[PDB]
Amino acid sequence: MPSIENFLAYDFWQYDVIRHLFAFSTAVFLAGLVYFAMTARTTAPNYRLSANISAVVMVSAALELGQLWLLWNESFQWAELQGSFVPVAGERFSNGYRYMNWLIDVPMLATQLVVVCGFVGTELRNRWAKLTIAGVLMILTGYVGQYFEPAVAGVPGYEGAEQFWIWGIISTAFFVWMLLILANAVRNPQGAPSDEVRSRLKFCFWFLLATWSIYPFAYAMPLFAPTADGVVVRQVIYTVADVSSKLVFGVILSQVALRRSAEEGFEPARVA
Ligand SMILES: CCCCCCCCCCCCCCCCCCCC
C-alpha cells in the first residue's frame, strides 16, 4: 500500500534534502565496507566473522538506500506551474521497501554481537536461529502494520488503522524477545574477558537497543499526520537510525572485537 510520503507535494528543498539523505547514506555504507575490510585483517580469527558480517550489512544497507533513492526520483515529477515535486500516478514510494533488507540487517547485527560475546559452534547457532526467527517475525508483522499507515495518518478514503496497532504491538513483542536473547548474551560472555570488555559488550547491547528503538518511532510518525516538513523529519530519523544501527554500531563493535583479540594475544590487534 502507499506510504504517507505518496500523498504530499514537495518544494525543491524538501525533495532535494530527502534525495541527499538516501545518496549520502549509500556512499557512507560503501565507505564503511573499506573500514571493515581493513579491520578484519587485524581481528583474531575467532572474532573476524563479526567484521565480515558488518561488510554484509554495509552492502545490504547500500542496496536498501540505493533503492529508496531510485524510487524517490521515479515516484515524483517536477510540476513547473506549482514549483513542486508531485506524486506520479501509478508510482508508489514506500519506506516499506526497506523492510525486505531488514531480513538481512536485523538477524546479522544481532548475531555479530553474539559472536563478539564469544559464543561458538552449537551455542552460537542456537542463538542465531532464535534471533533469525524473532527478527523475521518482527519484520513481517511490522510490514503488515505499516501497510495501513495512510489510514493512521487520516489520508481520506483509507481504512484499517487498527491493523497498525495490532501488528505494531505484535512486532514490538518480537523486538523484546530479540533484546532479551541479546541481554542474556552480553551478561554471559564466553572466555575470560577483562572488566573493560564486559562493560563494553553491555555498552554495545544498549547502543543496539537505543538505535533499533528509533525504527518503531519512525513507524509511528503517521500518528502525527505529517505535512511535507514532517516527512523530511521522518526520513532524517530513518537516516540517523540506519547510520547509527549499522555503521556506528559496527565500528564500536569492531573496536571491542579488536580489544578481545589483543587480550587473547593476537599481535596484529595489540599493534592496533
Ligand atoms: C588491508 C586490506 C586491504 C584494503 C581492503 C579495502 C578494499 C575495499 C573493501 C572490499 C570491498 C569490495 C567489494 C565490492 C562490492 C561492493 C558492492 C556494491 C554494491 C552496490
Author numbering: 1 to 272
Sentences from the paper on this structure:
NaRs are membrane proteins that actively transport sodium outside of the cell in response to light illumination. As all other MRs, the structure of NDQ rhodopsins consists of seven transmembrane helices (A-G) encapsulating a retinal cofactor, covalently attached to the lysine residue of the helix G (K255 in KR2) via a Schiff base (RSB).
The structures of the rhodopsin at pH 4.6 and 8.8 appeared nearly identical (RMSD of 0.06 Å). E64, a unique characteristic residue of ErNaR and Subgroup 2 of NDQ rhodopsins, is pointed towards the RSB and interacts directly with D105 (D116 in KR2). As a result, a large Schiff base cavity found in the ground state of KR2 in the pentameric form is absent in ErNaR and only one water molecule is found in this region. In contrast to KR2, ErNaR adapts the N-out conformation in the pH range of 4.3-8.8 in both monomeric and pentameric forms.
